[PDB]
Amino acid sequence: YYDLTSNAVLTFIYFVVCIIGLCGNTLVIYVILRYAKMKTITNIYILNLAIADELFMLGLPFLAMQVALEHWPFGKAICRVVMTVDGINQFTSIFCLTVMSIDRYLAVVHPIKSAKWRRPRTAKMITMAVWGVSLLVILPIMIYAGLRSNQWGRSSCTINWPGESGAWYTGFIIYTFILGFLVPLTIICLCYLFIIIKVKSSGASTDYWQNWTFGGGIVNAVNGSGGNYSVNWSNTGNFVVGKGWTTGSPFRTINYNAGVWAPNGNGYLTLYGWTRSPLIEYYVVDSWGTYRPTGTYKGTVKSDGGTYDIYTTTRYNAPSIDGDDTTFTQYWSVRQSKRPTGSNATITFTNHVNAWKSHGMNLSNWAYQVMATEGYQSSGSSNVTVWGSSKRKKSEKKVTRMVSIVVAVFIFCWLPFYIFNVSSVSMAISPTPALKGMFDFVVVLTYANSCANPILYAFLDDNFKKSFQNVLCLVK
Ligand SMILES: C[C@@H](c1c[nH]c2ccccc12)[C@@H](NC(=O)N1CCC(n2c(=O)[nH]c3ccccc32)CC1)C(=O)N[C@@H](CCCCN)C(=O)OC(C)(C)C
C-alpha cells in the first residue's frame, strides 16, 4: 500500500523538472532583458510567461517534500504562501498565453487598424493587468489554503473545504477548470481558427488540385503536403497534373520549385489555365522533354531572367472544359531554352497577359490556373511545389506558428491534471499507491510545461536560438 522506491523516483523527477525549468526560464529572461534585438512586442508577453514560469519553479521544492513524505513540514503559514504564489503564477501563465494569441490574431487579421494597440507601452499595461486579474481569481486559494490530516498520521497542505462542505470544493473545481483552462483555450483556438481561415483566404497558398488523365497508361500522382505534388507516369495518352487556384486572375505571381523534372518524351512543365467568354486555353512553358510546343509566331516577352516566344493555335472538334467536341483558341508563351530546375522560380503572370493583349491575344469568366505537369505518349517523373506570395513577412509567420505550438504543448501538460481533478470531485478518496502516484505524476506534468517553453523557443525562433547560442556556445 506504499512503494518507497516509486515514491523516491517521483521525488527525483520533481527536482529535475525544477532545475531544467529554472535554467531555461532564467536564460529566456536574461536574453530578452539584456539584448536590444529581443525587444519585440511578442517578447514582452514571453518575458511575463517566463517570469511566471520561473516563480512557479520556486514552489516545487516545498511540494516535493510532500511527495516524498506525504507530510508538510513548514507550518500553516508557509502553506498558505506557497499555495497562493503557486496559484497566481498558474493563472498568469495561461492568461499570458491568451493575450499572446489575441496579439497574433490582431497582427494577421487586422494589422492596419491595430497599429495603435501594438505599441510596446500598452502591451506593458496589458501584462500588469494580467497579474492583477490573477490575484483576484486566486483569492479563494488565499482564504482557504491550509493543513489537513491524512491516513498516515501526517499533515497535507491542500485547499480546505470552505465551511467543510463538499459542495463548495466542487464549485471551486468547476471555477478553476473554466477560468484556468476552458475559457482561455476557447479564446485561443477561435483566434487561431480565424488566423488560418484568413491566411488560406489570401493567395499565399494554393487551393486547387488537378489530376486529369484521359486514360491510357499509368499516371500515378501524389497530392502531397501543402503546395507540393509528385507525378510518376509511363506510356500514357494525354494527362495534366498540377496545383494552383480554383479562380485565376491576371495579376498573380506564381512561385515553384521543380525538385524533379525528369521527362522521358513529350511532357510540359508549364503554367496552365482556361477562361470563358471567350473560351481560350493558355500556357507559359518553362521546360519540356523531347518536344517544344509551337504555333503561329507573334512576338516575344522578357521575364524572370529569360525570354519567351508567343504563339497561338486554334483547336476544333477538340476537348475543352465546356464540352468534348468544341472549338477554342490557345495562347502560348514558350521559353526559348529550357529553364533550369531544382531552385525557386517565378512566373510574373501580368507580364505575359499584357504582352498577349498587345498582339491581339486577349483573355471574362475565369477558370482554374495551375502550375502543371502535362504529358502525351511519354514516361517520366516530376516533383514540384507551388505557392503564391504574401503581404506578411516570413518572420511573423514563424512567430505566429511558434505560439500555436506553445499552445498545443500547454494543452498536453494541463489536461491530465484537470481530468483528474474533475474525477476527484466524484468521491475518489481511496488513496492508493496506484492513484497516489497517478496524482503526483499528473501534477508534475503541469510543472514540466514550464521546462518545455524555453526549449520550444530555441527550435522555433531564430532570434531565441541565436541569443541562446551566444551564451552557451564558446568562442576564442
Ligand atoms: C485542490 C487542488 C489545487 C490546489 N491548488 C490548486 C490551483 C488550481 C486548481 C486546483 C488546485 C489540489 N488538489 C488536492 O489537494 N486534492 C486532495 C485530494 C486528492 N485525492 C482524493 O480526493 N482522492 C485521491 C486518491 C489518490 C491520490 C489523491 C487523491 C486529489 C485532490 C492540488 O492539486 N494540489 C497540488 C498542487 C498543484 C497545484 C497546481 N498548480 C498538489 O498537492 O500536488 C502534490 C503536492 C504533488 C500532491
Numbering used by the authors: 37 to 239, 1000 to 1159, 1161 to 1184, 243 to 331
The paper states:
Somatostatin (SST), an inhibitory hormone that distributes widely in both human central nervous system and periphery tissues negatively regulates multiple hormone releases (growth hormone, glucagon, insulin, gastrin and cholecystokinin) and cell proliferation through SST receptors (SSTRs). Here, we report five structures of SSTR2 and SSTR4 in different states, including two crystal structures of SSTR2 in complex with a selective peptide antagonist and a non-peptide agonist, respectively, a cryo-electron microscopy (cryo-EM) structure of Gi1-bound SSTR2 in the presence of the endogenous ligand SST-14, as well as two cryo-EM structures of Gi1-bound SSTR4 in complex with SST-14 and a small-molecule agonist J-2156, respectively. The overall structures of SSTR2 and SSTR4 possess the canonical seven-transmembrane (7-TM) architecture with an extended helix VIII in parallel with the membrane.
L-054,522 was identified and optimized by Merck that mimics the side chains of W8 and K9 at the β turn tip of the endogenous peptide SST-14, and displayed at least 3000-fold better selectivity for SSTR2.16,17 This full agonist exerts an inhibitory effect on growth hormone and glucagon releases, while SSTR4 selective agonist, J-2156, mediates pain relief. To solve the crystal structure of L-054,522-bound SSTR2, D892.50 was reinstated as in wild type (WT) and the junction site of xylanase was adjusted between I240 and V242 to improve crystal quality. Crystals of both complexes were obtained in monoolein lipid phases and determined at 2.65 Å and 2.6 Å resolution, respectively. It slants from helix III to the hydrophobic cavity formed by helices VI, VII and ECL3 of SSTR2 and makes extensive interactions with the receptor. Anchored by the conserved polar interactions with D1223.32 and Q1263.36, the chemical group of β-methyl-(d)-W–K of L-054,522 is also involved in similar hydrophobic interactions with conserved residues of SSTR2, including F2085.38, T2125.42, F2726.51, N2766.55, V2987.39 and Y3027.43. The tert-butyl ester of L-054,522 stretches to the hydrophobic pocket formed by helices II and VII, which would strengthen the hydrophobic interactions with L992.60, Q1022.63 and V1032.64 of SSTR2.
